[PDB]
Structures are given as C-alpha cells and as structure tokens.
C-alpha cells in the first residue's frame, strides 16, 4: 500500500494508487544538493505544465478527444488493464509517446477556440 507498491500489479489495479505516487514527487558542499532540489521542482513543473496544455490540469485521471491508433498498440482492454503492468506498457508504446503528446496538444487548442466562440 506504499510508494510503488503497485508497480508489479496490473494497470487496472495500479491506477487506484495514483495519489500514493503523486505525493512522493515533492520532498562548495551543499550546492549539489540545491541543484538536485531545484531540478526536482523544475521537473515537476514541466509535467504539470504539460497536463495543463492538454486540458488535464488538476486531475489524476483525464479523458480526452484523441482516438487511439491501433498502429500504436493493437491489444484489447483485457490484455492491457488485466495484464501488462504499467512498466510493461511503458516499454511497448515508448516509441509513440511524442506522437500522442502532440495530438493531445492539437486537440486542446481546437477545444479552447470552439468554446470561446460559443461564449460569443
């Protein structure tokens, strides 16, 4: 039930421990320790900025309007959520995360403009 305890569990089980890991992301001699702390903050903020760009700010589970390409993975839901742990899944689609991230950004950019014109 602690940090990374679910690392060996199935994706559908591990997805219930997202707050366990989220809370462990934040907290001349002594300078390299400041560099490590500053860097940890910068890393954290980049992931948070990215979620904001995709329209997922403030949440751990975020649904989008980006469809899945089976060229990315053609496994079904029982193969992915009831087997392939998150470590296994990450390896399998590592080659596609930049394509997916680009498509999440493009979608949010269309959504924010369509919503401003409906408030007009």
């Amino acid at each position: 039930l602690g940090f990374l305890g679910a690392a060996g569990s199935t994706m559908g089980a591990a997805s219930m421990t997202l707050t366990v890991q989220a809370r462990n992301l934040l907290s001349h001699w002594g300078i390299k320790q400041l560099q490590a702390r500053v860097l940890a903050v910068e890393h954290y903020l980049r992931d948070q900025q990215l979620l904001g760009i995709w329209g997922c700010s403030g949440k751990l589970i975020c649904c989008t309007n980006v469809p899945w390409n089976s060229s990315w993975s053609n496994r079904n839901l029982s193969e992915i959520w009831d087997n392939m742990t998150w470590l296994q899944w990450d390896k399998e689609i590592s080659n596609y995360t930049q394509i997916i991230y680009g498509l999440l950004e493009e979608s949010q950019n269309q959504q924010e403009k369509n919503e401003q014109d409906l408030l007009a």
């Binding site: 390299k32 649904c63 470590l87």
Partner: peptide
Amino acid sequence: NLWVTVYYGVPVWKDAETT
C-alpha cells in the same frame, strides 16, 4: 472505439543518475 486517457501518478521508473 478507444480513446487516449491520461494518467498521472503511474508507478513507472527509468534508470537514472542523480546526486
């Protein structure tokens, strides 16, 4: 059919060097 869902707090890691 299926849609991209974003998850944050996933128990995944990569080898790394740090201080």
